[PDB]
Write a protein that holds these residues in place. Structure first.
Motif, PDB file in Angstrom:
ATOM      1  N   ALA A   1       0.831  -1.193   0.000  1.00  0.00           N
ATOM      2  CA  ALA A   1       0.000   0.000   0.000  1.00  0.00           C
ATOM      3  C   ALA A   1       0.869   1.247   0.000  1.00  0.00           C
ATOM      4  CB  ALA A   1      -0.911   0.002   1.199  1.00  0.00           C
ATOM      5  N   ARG A   2       1.990   1.173   0.709  1.00  0.00           N
ATOM      6  CA  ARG A   2       2.914   2.287   0.817  1.00  0.00           C
ATOM      7  C   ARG A   2       3.634   2.591  -0.512  1.00  0.00           C
ATOM      8  NH1 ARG A   2       6.837  -1.943   3.631  1.00  0.00           N
ATOM      9  NH2 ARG A   2       7.685  -2.497   1.560  1.00  0.00           N
ATOM     10  N   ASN A   3       3.653   1.636  -1.435  1.00  0.00           N
ATOM     11  CA  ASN A   3       4.164   1.837  -2.794  1.00  0.00           C
ATOM     12  C   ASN A   3       3.050   2.011  -3.826  1.00  0.00           C
ATOM     13  OD1 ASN A   3       6.825   1.661  -1.931  1.00  0.00           O
ATOM     14  ND2 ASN A   3       6.847  -0.571  -2.127  1.00  0.00           N
ATOM     15  N   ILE A   4       1.851   2.298  -3.338  1.00  0.00           N
ATOM     16  CA  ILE A   4       0.752   2.633  -4.225  1.00  0.00           C
ATOM     17  C   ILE A   4       0.461   4.091  -3.977  1.00  0.00           C
ATOM     18  CG2 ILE A   4      -1.673   2.230  -4.892  1.00  0.00           C
ATOM     19  CD1 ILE A   4       0.006  -0.280  -5.251  1.00  0.00           C
ATOM     20  N   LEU A   5       0.357   4.865  -5.052  1.00  0.00           N
ATOM     21  CA  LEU A   5      -0.036   6.271  -4.957  1.00  0.00           C
ATOM     22  C   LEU A   5      -1.508   6.495  -5.335  1.00  0.00           C
ATOM     23  CD1 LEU A   5       3.132   7.981  -6.544  1.00  0.00           C
ATOM     24  CD2 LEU A   5       2.519   8.134  -4.135  1.00  0.00           C
ATOM     25  N   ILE A   6      -2.116   7.524  -4.756  1.00  0.00           N
ATOM     26  CA  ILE A   6      -3.536   7.800  -4.990  1.00  0.00           C
ATOM     27  C   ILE A   6      -3.754   9.281  -5.288  1.00  0.00           C
ATOM     28  CG2 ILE A   6      -3.927   7.837  -2.422  1.00  0.00           C
ATOM     29  CD1 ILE A   6      -6.891   6.754  -3.210  1.00  0.00           C
ATOM     30  N   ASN A   7      -4.516   9.580  -6.347  1.00  0.00           N
ATOM     31  CA  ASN A   7      -4.750  10.982  -6.761  1.00  0.00           C
ATOM     32  C   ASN A   7      -6.044  11.612  -6.213  1.00  0.00           C
ATOM     33  OD1 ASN A   7      -6.843  10.081  -8.443  1.00  0.00           O
ATOM     34  ND2 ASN A   7      -5.647  10.321 -10.351  1.00  0.00           N
ATOM     35  N   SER A   8      -6.393  12.801  -6.706  1.00  0.00           N
ATOM     36  CA  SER A   8      -7.553  13.518  -6.181  1.00  0.00           C
ATOM     37  C   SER A   8      -8.892  12.883  -6.587  1.00  0.00           C
ATOM     38  CB  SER A   8      -7.501  15.008  -6.549  1.00  0.00           C
ATOM     39  OG  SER A   8      -7.474  15.189  -7.950  1.00  0.00           O
ATOM     40  N   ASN A   9      -8.874  12.011  -7.587  1.00  0.00           N
ATOM     41  CA  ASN A   9     -10.080  11.274  -7.953  1.00  0.00           C
ATOM     42  C   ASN A   9     -10.158   9.910  -7.261  1.00  0.00           C
ATOM     43  OD1 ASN A   9      -9.534  12.859 -11.006  1.00  0.00           O
ATOM     44  ND2 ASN A   9     -11.406  13.233  -9.832  1.00  0.00           N
ATOM     45  N   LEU A  10      -9.211   9.668  -6.357  1.00  0.00           N
ATOM     46  CA  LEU A  10      -9.051   8.389  -5.661  1.00  0.00           C
ATOM     47  C   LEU A  10      -8.583   7.272  -6.603  1.00  0.00           C
ATOM     48  CD1 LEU A  10     -12.190   8.392  -3.215  1.00  0.00           C
ATOM     49  CD2 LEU A  10     -10.011   9.554  -2.892  1.00  0.00           C
ATOM     50  N   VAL A  11      -7.966   7.647  -7.725  1.00  0.00           N
ATOM     51  CA  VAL A  11      -7.403   6.657  -8.643  1.00  0.00           C
ATOM     52  C   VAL A  11      -6.059   6.178  -8.075  1.00  0.00           C
ATOM     53  CG1 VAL A  11      -6.409   6.277 -10.936  1.00  0.00           C
ATOM     54  CG2 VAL A  11      -8.664   7.275 -10.747  1.00  0.00           C
ATOM     55  N   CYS A  12      -5.909   4.862  -7.938  1.00  0.00           N
ATOM     56  CA  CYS A  12      -4.720   4.261  -7.368  1.00  0.00           C
ATOM     57  C   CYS A  12      -3.775   3.790  -8.462  1.00  0.00           C
ATOM     58  CB  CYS A  12      -5.103   3.098  -6.466  1.00  0.00           C
ATOM     59  SG  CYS A  12      -5.931   3.592  -4.964  1.00  0.00           S
ATOM     60  N   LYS A  13      -2.488   4.090  -8.293  1.00  0.00           N
ATOM     61  CA  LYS A  13      -1.493   3.704  -9.294  1.00  0.00           C
ATOM     62  C   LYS A  13      -0.262   3.026  -8.676  1.00  0.00           C
ATOM     63  CE  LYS A  13      -2.999   7.683 -12.111  1.00  0.00           C
ATOM     64  NZ  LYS A  13      -3.021   8.127 -13.513  1.00  0.00           N
ATOM     65  N   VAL A  14       0.206   1.973  -9.340  1.00  0.00           N
ATOM     66  CA  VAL A  14       1.432   1.284  -8.950  1.00  0.00           C
ATOM     67  C   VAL A  14       2.598   2.234  -9.201  1.00  0.00           C
ATOM     68  CG1 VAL A  14       2.878  -0.781  -9.263  1.00  0.00           C
ATOM     69  CG2 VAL A  14       0.365  -0.831  -9.818  1.00  0.00           C
ATOM     70  N   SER A  15       3.496   2.273  -8.227  1.00  0.00           N
ATOM     71  CA  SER A  15       4.614   3.175  -8.190  1.00  0.00           C
ATOM     72  C   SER A  15       5.817   2.366  -7.729  1.00  0.00           C
ATOM     73  CB  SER A  15       4.307   4.285  -7.176  1.00  0.00           C
ATOM     74  OG  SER A  15       5.357   5.225  -7.101  1.00  0.00           O
ATOM     75  N   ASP A  16       6.951   3.052  -7.561  1.00  0.00           N
ATOM     76  CA  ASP A  16       8.200   2.480  -7.033  1.00  0.00           C
ATOM     77  C   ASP A  16       8.676   1.184  -7.739  1.00  0.00           C
ATOM     78  OD1 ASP A  16       9.910   2.792  -3.997  1.00  0.00           O
ATOM     79  OD2 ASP A  16      10.029   0.936  -5.191  1.00  0.00           O
ATOM     80  N   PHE A  17       9.363   1.348  -8.872  1.00  0.00           N
ATOM     81  CA  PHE A  17       9.887   0.233  -9.678  1.00  0.00           C
ATOM     82  C   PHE A  17      11.395   0.025  -9.515  1.00  0.00           C
ATOM     83  CE2 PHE A  17       6.237   2.226 -11.525  1.00  0.00           C
ATOM     84  CZ  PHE A  17       5.356   1.139 -11.714  1.00  0.00           C
ATOM     85  N   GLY A  18      11.908   0.383  -8.338  1.00  0.00           N
ATOM     86  CA  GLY A  18      13.271   0.032  -7.935  1.00  0.00           C
ATOM     87  C   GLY A  18      13.522  -1.469  -7.917  1.00  0.00           C
ATOM     88  N   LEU A  19      12.554  -2.241  -7.411  1.00  0.00           N
ATOM     89  CA  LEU A  19      12.718  -3.703  -7.351  1.00  0.00           C
ATOM     90  C   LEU A  19      12.115  -4.463  -8.545  1.00  0.00           C
ATOM     91  CD1 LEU A  19      12.667  -5.018  -3.605  1.00  0.00           C
ATOM     92  CD2 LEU A  19      14.650  -4.344  -5.002  1.00  0.00           C
ATOM     93  N   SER A  20      11.449  -3.746  -9.454  1.00  0.00           N
ATOM     94  CA  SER A  20      10.872  -4.339 -10.674  1.00  0.00           C
ATOM     95  C   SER A  20      11.914  -4.986 -11.575  1.00  0.00           C
ATOM     96  CB  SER A  20      10.127  -3.289 -11.493  1.00  0.00           C
ATOM     97  OG  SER A  20       8.752  -3.297 -11.174  1.00  0.00           O
ATOM     98  N   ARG A  21      11.669  -6.243 -11.938  1.00  0.00           N
ATOM     99  CA  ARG A  21      12.577  -6.980 -12.811  1.00  0.00           C
ATOM    100  C   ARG A  21      11.788  -7.614 -13.936  1.00  0.00           C
ATOM    101  NH1 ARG A  21      15.008  -4.370  -9.912  1.00  0.00           N
ATOM    102  NH2 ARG A  21      16.654  -4.810  -8.402  1.00  0.00           N
ATOM    103  N   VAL A  22      12.447  -7.828 -15.073  1.00  0.00           N
ATOM    104  CA  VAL A  22      11.817  -8.486 -16.216  1.00  0.00           C
ATOM    105  C   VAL A  22      11.832  -9.998 -15.987  1.00  0.00           C
ATOM    106  CG1 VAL A  22      13.337  -6.819 -17.464  1.00  0.00           C
ATOM    107  CG2 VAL A  22      13.261  -9.167 -18.270  1.00  0.00           C
ATOM    108  N   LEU A  23      10.683 -10.650 -16.154  1.00  0.00           N
ATOM    109  CA  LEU A  23      10.600 -12.119 -16.049  1.00  0.00           C
ATOM    110  C   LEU A  23      11.467 -12.851 -17.079  1.00  0.00           C
ATOM    111  CD1 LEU A  23       8.757 -12.963 -13.746  1.00  0.00           C
ATOM    112  CD2 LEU A  23       7.181 -11.541 -15.162  1.00  0.00           C
ATOM    113  N   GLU A  24      12.149 -13.904 -16.634  1.00  0.00           N
ATOM    114  CA  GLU A  24      12.915 -14.763 -17.543  1.00  0.00           C
ATOM    115  C   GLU A  24      12.053 -15.870 -18.159  1.00  0.00           C
ATOM    116  OE1 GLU A  24      16.996 -14.221 -14.969  1.00  0.00           O
ATOM    117  OE2 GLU A  24      16.929 -15.847 -16.472  1.00  0.00           O
TER     118      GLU A  24
END
Ligand code: CL
Length: 283
Positions: free
Chosen positions: A142-165
């Motif tokens: 939840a702490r890596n999910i951001l939320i805007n003024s319309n309450l739209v939630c977006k995935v954030s923080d791609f420091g640990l994001s990796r491409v699947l093998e």
């Protein structure tokens, strides 16, 4: 290399409004982006602090070339980068209400089931898209999910994001694991898949409906690993619909092959939103 996926922005087009935080690679700022023909766009600006190591530059700009690959309303949008001058910047869309966990804590008990399911539907939509794109997030909370003024939630923080093998579909770590959000096989074997992201997503579901409770409360990391391994699962939050809680349990299947796919999650959530039984108000 980041230019293959990110547009270079003329420095003169960015003005910094306020410093709103500090990330690992320096300050995070609220600012304005001026593009030709339109109003200044509010943006979040990550700056690379003076005197950075060259490794830090690669890894900072690393996230931007991950972000630039995605075009989806529930994934934080990249406006671009500044690399031709100092300071080096990454310019993303602005999310008015900041982190999801923090936002829900300030608004304890304030949302309807439909409003909260709505947030969770957005998150799973972005994850579905991420899954499809060949990526695993690894850090979904939840702490890596951001939320805007319309309450739209977006995935954030791609420091640990990796491409699947390409295997019978996983990344193996080389170890900044957030334990209470992580699937057991990812903890034990360090094998990360879209299905371990679904486990994390189950945790997010529980955080959202709990209004930002810490998963497993004061339990130590050892306490949690042992508990989950034994079969224990987090109990149902107050005022949680049975079918939502059951979807959580489904995400928390020990065998990853038994968790639902993100597309299945999105469909189940759409069905709840469309079910009048879950609408407290009918007028
Ligand atoms: Cl119910």
């Amino acid at each position: 290399a980041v230019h293959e996926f990110a547009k270079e922005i003329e420095a003169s087009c960015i003005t910094i409004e306020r410093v709103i935080g500090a990330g690992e690679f320096g300050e995070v700022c609220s600012g304005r982006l001026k593009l030709p023909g339109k109003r200044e766009l509010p943006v979040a600006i990550k700056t690379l602090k003076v005197g950075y190591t060259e490794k830090q530059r690669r890894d900072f700009l690393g996230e931007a070339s991950i972000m630039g690959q995605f075009d989806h309303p529930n994934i934080i949008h990249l406006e671009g980068v500044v690399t031709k001058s100092k300071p080096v910047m990454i310019v993303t869309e602005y999310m008015e209400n900041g982190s999801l966990d923090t936002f829900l804590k300030k608004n304890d008990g304030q949302f309807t089931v439909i409003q909260l399911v709505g947030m969770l539907r957005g998150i799973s939509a972005g994850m579905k898209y991420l899954s499809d794109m060949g990526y695993v997030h690894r850090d979904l909370a939840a702490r890596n999910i951001l939320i805007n003024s319309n309450l739209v939630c977006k995935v954030s923080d791609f420091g640990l994001s990796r491409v699947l093998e390409d295997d019978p579909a996983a990344y193996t770590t080389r170890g900044k694991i957030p334990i209470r959000w992580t699937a057991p096989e990812a903890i034990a074997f360090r094998k990360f898949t879209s299905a371990s992201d679904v486990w994390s997503y189950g945790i997010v579901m529980w955080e959202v409906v709990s209004y930002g409770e810490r998963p497993y409360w004061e339990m130590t990391n050892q306490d949690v690993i042992k508990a989950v391994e034994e079969g224990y699962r987090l109990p149902s939050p107050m005022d949680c619909p049975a079918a939502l809680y059951q979807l959580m349990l489904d995400c928390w299947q020990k065998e990853r092959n038994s968790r639902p796919k993100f597309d299945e999650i999105v469909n189940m959530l759409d069905k709840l939103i469309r079910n009048p039984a879950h609408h407290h108000h009918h007028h």
